[PDB]
């Protein structure tokens, strides 16, 4: 088993009508636990998970102070990055920041990620060593040289390797029956008739946690397959399906394979 914490901080510059929009979205494994929005009536760190309400008022005030502090930090960073690329003030730009740590079944630290983005493209990222930075362009090298003297790489390393792991293990304890749970997928194969003398077979997988699943179609063993992205049901479970164009009569010749951590053995499915 493996569990990971992820914080998604986004800053969207609004030209003329803002006051840029700042959103913080937190995730533990595949479930949302914290939320922050500058456009909200009362800008404060809100719980999205019911088990997160157990945390005291001192924690929420501390996370709001961090979020409000980051809001003005990204606001200054938006104007700084505007000067780095020498772009017009009339245009709208976005800064994305995702960070967190991944722990094993021990459960101790495996990898720490801390990456930045400007207008949906890579800007600066902290390497796997958690001591060096990788700059995408010449404007990002200015940020790297500024963070080398300031010692940002060593500062973030102190969090990702220690403070991140410490809190991730705490959130797993708070949501013991919500995060550590594993629901097996409800699988069934559906038949769809065609007009070109061929039928479409769909291998369904509904109601499962976590989202990590791999659906494959086998004949005697892949490229001809039509797999869709894992979609959330809304109630707390996920959905995913694979489709193949197969000839009429050979409905039982094609077998589907489901790979999920909730299942003790990989399932074999056929149309009936």
């Amino acid at each position: 088993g493996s569990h990971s914490m992820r914080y998604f901080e986004t800053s969207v510059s609004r030209p003329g009508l803002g006051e840029p929009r700042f959103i913080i979205v937190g995730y533990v494994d595949d479930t949302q636990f914290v939320r922050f929005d500058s456009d909200a009536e009362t800008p404060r760190m809100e719980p999205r998970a019911p088990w997160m309400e157990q945390e005291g008022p001192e924690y929420w005030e501390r996370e709001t102070q961090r979020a409000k502090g980051n809001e003005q930090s990204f606001h200054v960073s938006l104007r700084t990055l505007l000067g780095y690329y020498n772009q017009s003030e009339s245009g709208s730009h976005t800064i994305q920041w995702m960070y967190g740590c991944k722990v094993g079944s021990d459960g101790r630290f495996l990898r720490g990620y801390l990456q930045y983005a400007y207008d949906g493209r890579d800007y600066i990222a902290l390497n796997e060593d958690l001591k060096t930075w990788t700059a995408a362009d010449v404007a990002a090298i200015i940020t790297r040289r500024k963070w080398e003297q300031a010692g940002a790489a060593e500062y973030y390393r102190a969090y990702l390797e220690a403070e991140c792991v410490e809190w991730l293990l705490r959130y797993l304890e708070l949501g013991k029956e919500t995060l550590l749970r594993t629901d097996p997928p409800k699988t069934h194969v559906t038949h769809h008739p065609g007009s070109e003398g061929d039928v479409t077979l769909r291998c369904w997988a509904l109601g499962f946690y976590p989202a990590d699943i791999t659906l494959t179609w086998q004949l005697n063993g892949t490229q001809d397959m039509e797999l869709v992205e894992t979609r959330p049901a809304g109630d707390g479970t996920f959905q995913k399906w694979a489709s193949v164009v197969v000839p009429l009569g050979k409905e039982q010749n094609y077998t589907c394979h489901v790979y999920h951590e909730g299942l003790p053995e990989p399932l074999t499915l056929r149309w009936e």
Binding site: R66, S77, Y116, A152, Y155, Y159, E163
Partner: peptide
């Protein structure tokens, strides 16, 4: 918890 952002 998260972490404080360093100015770009």
């Amino acid at each position: 918890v998260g972490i404080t952002n360093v100015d770009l």
